[PDB]
Design an enzyme around this catalytic site. Structure first.
Site, short mmCIF file in Angstrom:
data_model
loop_
_atom_site.label_atom_id
_atom_site.label_comp_id
_atom_site.label_asym_id
_atom_site.label_seq_id
_atom_site.Cartn_x
_atom_site.Cartn_y
_atom_site.Cartn_z
N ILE A 11 0.53 -0.89 0.20
CA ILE A 11 0.10 0.29 0.07
C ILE A 11 0.58 1.39 -0.10
CG2 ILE A 11 -1.56 1.12 0.91
CD1 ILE A 11 -2.45 -1.46 2.30
N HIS A 17 -12.36 1.55 10.73
CA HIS A 17 -11.80 0.71 10.13
C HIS A 17 -12.21 0.02 8.07
CE1 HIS A 17 -8.25 -2.16 10.88
NE2 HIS A 17 -8.73 -2.86 9.46
N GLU A 36 -10.30 -2.28 19.33
CA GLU A 36 -11.04 -2.05 18.04
C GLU A 36 -11.94 -3.22 18.47
OE1 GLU A 36 -11.11 -1.09 13.70
OE2 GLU A 36 -8.68 -1.34 13.90
N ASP A 44 -7.95 5.68 10.38
CA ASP A 44 -9.33 4.46 10.39
C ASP A 44 -8.75 3.27 11.06
OD1 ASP A 44 -11.77 3.30 8.06
OD2 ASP A 44 -9.74 2.15 7.67
N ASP A 82 11.79 2.40 5.74
CA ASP A 82 11.51 1.78 5.30
C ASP A 82 13.09 0.52 5.68
OD1 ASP A 82 10.59 -0.99 5.61
OD2 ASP A 82 9.47 -0.38 4.08
#
Ligand SMILES: NC(=O)c1ccc[n+]([C@@H]2O[C@H](COP(=O)([O-])OP(=O)(O)OC[C@H]3O[C@@H](n4cnc5c(N)ncnc54)[C@H](OP(=O)(O)O)[C@@H]3O)[C@@H](O)[C@H]2O)c1
Ligand SMILES: NC(=O)c1ccc[n+]([C@@H]2O[C@H](COP(=O)([O-])OP(=O)(O)OC[C@H]3O[C@@H](n4cnc5c(N)ncnc54)[C@H](OP(=O)(O)O)[C@@H]3O)[C@@H](O)[C@H]2O)c1
Ligand SMILES: NC(=O)c1ccc[n+]([C@@H]2O[C@H](COP(=O)([O-])OP(=O)(O)OC[C@H]3O[C@@H](n4cnc5c(N)ncnc54)[C@H](O)[C@@H]3O)[C@@H](O)[C@H]2O)c1
Ligand SMILES: NC(=O)c1ccc[n+]([C@@H]2O[C@H](COP(=O)([O-])OP(=O)(O)OC[C@H]3O[C@@H](n4cnc5c(N)ncnc54)[C@H](O)[C@@H]3O)[C@@H](O)[C@H]2O)c1
Lengths: 318, 318
Positions: free
Chosen positions: A151, A281, A262, A257, A171
């Site tokens: 992504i 989400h 959760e 998001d 990264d």
């Protein structure tokens, strides 16, 4: 063979696939007693994220041979209890790259254009806000991407080329050529990304190294005018640090998001701030993405019942 | 020479440019009496959109030689009164292509991801809305563009290539090769665009032909699941037809930045609907765009005072 769906799939095609080969029962937003009675004689279980599969239910399921989550996340399933019974726990990851990419772009643009705020100002007759607040032009701004995976790379590519942004990527597990491919610059110093960026978008895998990697110190190094976007996992952000950072104006806004935990509580301290926007989400939950995950969940359930090894085993020791 | 700014410019650089060569006075959100007293001995006038310059003020301005608007629109200025006095009226168009392009993308994505709605659902503790409403994946959807000009082409290019959308364009005054250039398909039948499109974004010039070209009949031909985006001009939409279309579910939603009339009233019938989002005519008003228009307005004011002909004369007969 009988199969129980705790929660619906993201698309009915996985359910019709399952019904063609097994006896399916679907339960939506169930109470615990419904789970206990429906799971006893069942061979496979599907669990709609983020509802929980506990050790009591797993112990009551005498014929249970395969558990499949709806998406990537397995934190709501008692995996330890399932491995003790030799039950296969299966994942469905990586089927929503395009969905999340689009969702990330929507949230970057929404913060840049101050969309939710300017919408209420017009609905409240304050069109004269034109003279007070101004939108941000994305061209030439610096986007910082944490995590140059599936992504992160796709977001990087669209923002540098279509949106004419300067993109930095942090990264540690990727060659600098991977950033070059999507017209980004790999940076080894997270501090450089944080101090340079006008928008920071989180896309790393959740590891020990990335857990709460965005805390108060990170928000202090970020520009006061910068925005945070998090579509990765809730644990990547230390939530009360973000509340403080927003309150004390260490950053300019946020779009999130993914929550921790959760589901989030109805009195989450972040809901108060107008410069923080939310989605429940859903970044990876388009019909196209749900159809792929539903077909993947059905397929892995059937393969286990037929002894064929499925691709996404979470406990390969069983 | 003295110059009066009715309203601030979109960026102070045009004001400092003007102050280097003239005596400048700035008035913000003025009452009519302030305009009358400050305009009498002035040589040039800048008018911040959308405040009005009427025939009484123009008649009171004995030395007035140049009027410049802040942007493209001149409907708030009594141009007829200015030509009767031989006063140059000057425009500042075409300096915000990138700003509006970005703004259009933000609104297409916002409607697709149901951003404003899902934000309140999370802020109101209704995260369980995950099981009810779902976002739309833009990939493979059809975008219909009315007006393949500067902004329409730029929006077309980003949506077909970066967002992987099928783009149709309707524009009677353009060759089909222009659509091919930005990976779009020109269509001569507006009906085909309306019936095909999942998102319709208006970017035409406001002409007699395009005035209210989007009325109830157009909204009936559009898909019930389709969305309207209007960043062009308010008069392109017949406003009560859009209210009816939204109410009776002829279309699925709307995002609008341009109103008729401007400013819109505080009791505009469209503010009620949750599937209609708004921005107060800011699509072209980023700092970068405002700085270009401000420098352009200052420059055209100075050129007239120095007898050099400016580029954007609205009444070239004077
Ligand atoms: N996409 C989003 O949801 C998003 C993103 C960023 C910002 N915002 C919101 O947008 C608003 C603009 O903030 P900014 O980033 O431009 O910095 P800012 O310095 O706070 O705002 C600039 C100008 O707007 C005024 N202002 C701030 N909030 C206002 C409000 N609710 N109503 C009327 N005027 C207001 C300020 O006046 P005062 O200093 O006197 O208050 C100041 O003159 C803020 O309220 C912020 O929370 C929303
Ligand atoms: N970007 C935006 O601002 C935007 C764009 C499009 C749509 N929306 C809004 O998003 C919501 C979803 O609509 P849709 O396009 O998906 O078609 P829909 O058929 O109206 O919604 C699908 C499901 O969501 C339910 N639903 C609709 N509105 C709801 C609400 N306020 N609260 C809880 N459930 C609701 C519906 O239940 P019921 O049929 O029983 O009501 C239905 O089960 C609508 O309210 C729409 O106005 C917002
Ligand atoms: N909101 C949603 O619906 C949704 C859907 C799918 C995935 N996600 C989440 O989005 C995120 C990105 O997904 P993906 O498909 O691109 O995963 P991916 O495996 O393809 O990429 C993850 C990247 O994280 C990098 N990374 C690892 N440690 C890092 C560190 N300390 N710092 C910076 N980067 C580090 C890895 O090297 C890898 O490149 C994941 O956390 C995934 O769980 C969210
Ligand atoms: N919201 C804002 O802040 C803002 C800022 C700048 C411009 N605008 C508006 O956006 C719109 C697009 O601006 P632009 O720079 O791309 O203008 P442009 O002149 O470059 O393109 C306008 C297009 O409209 C086309 N057109 C003419 N008649 C048509 C018809 N009947 N049907 C379909 N198309 C037709 C023309 O052929 C032309 O291609 C304009 O109306 C402009 O006034 C809004």
């Amino acid at each position: 063979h009988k199969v129980l769906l705790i929660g619906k799939m993201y698309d009915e095609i996985g359910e019709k696939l399952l019904a063609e080969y097994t006896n399916v029962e679907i339960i939506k937003e169930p109470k615990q007693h419904q789970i206990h009675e429906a799971i006893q004689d069942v061979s496979g279980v599907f669990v709609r994220y983020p509802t929980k599969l506990d050790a009591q239910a797993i112990g009551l399921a005498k014929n249970l041979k395969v558990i499949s989550t709806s998406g990537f996340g397995t934190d709501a399933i008692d995996i330890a209890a399932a491995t003790k019974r030799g039950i296969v726990v299966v994942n469905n990851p990586g089927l929503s790259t395009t969905a999340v990419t689009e969702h990330t772009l929507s949230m970057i643009l929404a913060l840049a254009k101050k969309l939710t705020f300017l919408n209420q100002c017009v609905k409240a007759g304050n069109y004269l806000i034109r003279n007070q607040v101004q939108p941000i032009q994305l061209e030439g701004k610096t986007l910082g991407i944490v995590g140059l995976g599936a992504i992160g790379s796709a977001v990087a590519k669209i923002c540098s080329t279509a949106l004419q942004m300067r993109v930095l990527a942090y990264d540690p597990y990727v060659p600098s050529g991977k950033a070059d491919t999507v017209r980004a610059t790999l940076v080894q110093d997270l501090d450089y990304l944080l101090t340079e960026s006008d928008f920071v978008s989180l896309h790393p895998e959740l590891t020990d190294e990335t857990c709460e990697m965005f805390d108060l110190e990170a928000f202090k190094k970020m520009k006061p005018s910068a925005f945070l976007i998090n579509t990765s996992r809730g644990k990547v952000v230390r939530q009360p640090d973000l509340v403080t950072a927003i309150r004390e104006k260490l950053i300019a806004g946020a779009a999130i998001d993914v929550f921790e935990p959760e589901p989030p509580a109805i009195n989450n301290p972040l809901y108060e701030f107008d410069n923080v926007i939310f989605s429940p989400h859903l970044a990876g939950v388009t019909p196209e993405a749900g159809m792929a995950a539903a077909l993947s969940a059905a397929n892995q359930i059937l393969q286990v019942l037929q002894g064929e090894k499925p691709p996404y085993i979470i406990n390969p020791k069983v």
